[PDB]
């Protein structure tokens, strides 16, 4: 048969938050990134980071090879957090795995 | 009809569901028009892209 209340394409999918509120949220997120307690609380491994906020020389923008990019992360102490991401690579549980996720 | 409310005047007594215009192609339309302008600019070079 026919499902109850069939789903329609003209459901209101999108949302328009006022621009000023979106700018408020971004500023709060930027400020939170400079608090080591919040960064640790979010699961990041910053135990070897020299300082927060972590500002590096502009020469990093000239890096072209991935091998040199990883060496830059090691020097500034950001590699352990990057290593955490790779070690967490896993298949998505549930139906999402067959949905191109 | 009940309580104190504005008198409703919804114009939804026809087969409106057959005449709904969605806008899911709005990002695509922006892309296509930008491509058309970019293509036009090269055709009329060095004439200004603003037109006449």
């Amino acid at each position: 048969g026919r499902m109850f209340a069939p789903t329609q394409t003209w459901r209101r999918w999108h949302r328009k938050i006022p621009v000023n509120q979106k700018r408020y949220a971004v500023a709060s997120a930027i400020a939170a990134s400079s608090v080591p307690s919040l960064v640790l609380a979010r699961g990041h491994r910053i135990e070897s980071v020299p300082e927060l906020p972590l500002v590096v020389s502009d020469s990093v923008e000239g890096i072209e090879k991935t091998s040199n990019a990883i060496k830059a992360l090691k020097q500034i102490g950001a590699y352990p957090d990057a290593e955490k991401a790779k070690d967490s690579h896993a298949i998505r549980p549930g139906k999402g795995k067959m949905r191109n996720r | 009809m009940k309580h104190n409310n504005v008198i409703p005047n919804g114009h939804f007594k026809k087969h409106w569901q057959n005449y709904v215009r969605t806008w899911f192609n709005q990002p695509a339309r922006k892309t296509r028009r930008r491509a058309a302008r970019q293509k036009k600019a090269a055709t009329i070079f060095p004439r200004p892209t603003a037109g006449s």
Binding site: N20, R23, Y24, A27, I30, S33, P53, L54, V55, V56, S57, D58, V60, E61, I76, A78 | -
Partner: protein
Amino acid sequence: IIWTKCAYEKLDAIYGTFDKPSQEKKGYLLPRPKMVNADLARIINSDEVQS
């Protein structure tokens, strides 16, 4: 977040400050909190309150 030096120096211009507005966000000023000092211990244990 890992900031480059150039990106870090642009934050004041992009988002402005509490005194002057942003250069790239027309008429935008950073929001103010309802509490200037969030350290309750200092306020509660201050001489003025404890007197």
